[PDB]
Design a protein around this ligand. Sequence first.
Ligand SMILES: CC(=O)N1[C@@H]2CC[C@H]1c1c(ncnc1N[C@H](c1ccc3c(c1)S(=O)(=O)CCC3)C(C)C)C2
Length: 169
Amino acid sequence: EVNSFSGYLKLTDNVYIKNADIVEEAKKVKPTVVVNAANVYLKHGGGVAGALNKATNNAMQVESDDYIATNGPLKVGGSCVLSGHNLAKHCLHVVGPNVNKGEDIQLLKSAYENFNQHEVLLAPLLSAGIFGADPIHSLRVCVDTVRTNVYLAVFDKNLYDKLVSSFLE
Ligand SMILES: CC(=O)N1[C@@H]2CC[C@H]1c1c(ncnc1N[C@H](c1ccc3c(c1)S(=O)(=O)CCC3)C(C)C)C2
């Protein structure tokens, strides 16, 4: 079955959240789209990007290198649609701002706007973790920006509980 999301808690009409590893969810669910928390050169060296790349056994990286060769880098707030390989039908590579490297938090709304071109997505919390944005603020931006159906996988129970407590739904 496609998009077989299970165990999510519905926060709003179109945003759901689960304490889970996004790669494990991609393998179980088989979604139409998995979102990658990418950088502008599509180099998947660690974190969510490294984990998704490793589960495709480097097929994501080879295809990403070919995208960059022909099209050039993305911009912060921008995206591209590539194959999802064995994890999903497509991978939506989205570049949120890295506030730990000085990029502007205003581009986080632009980053989430890319999700609106896909009816259903499995995604991570953009710009959270090593990108340095306040994860609770990133969830508020997601809720206010995304209008399609988004299932967020957040792999830290401590953070998940703080997000659910802040949201109160
Ligand atoms: C095994 C493991 O701990 N994980 C893998 C890959 C990373 C971690 C993980 C997995 N699935 C979902 N959220 C995860 N981490 C969250 C998260 C959310 C967004 C971002 C990152 C991290 S990042 O990679 O640090 C920078 C890009 C944006 C974290 C906040 C708990 C699966």
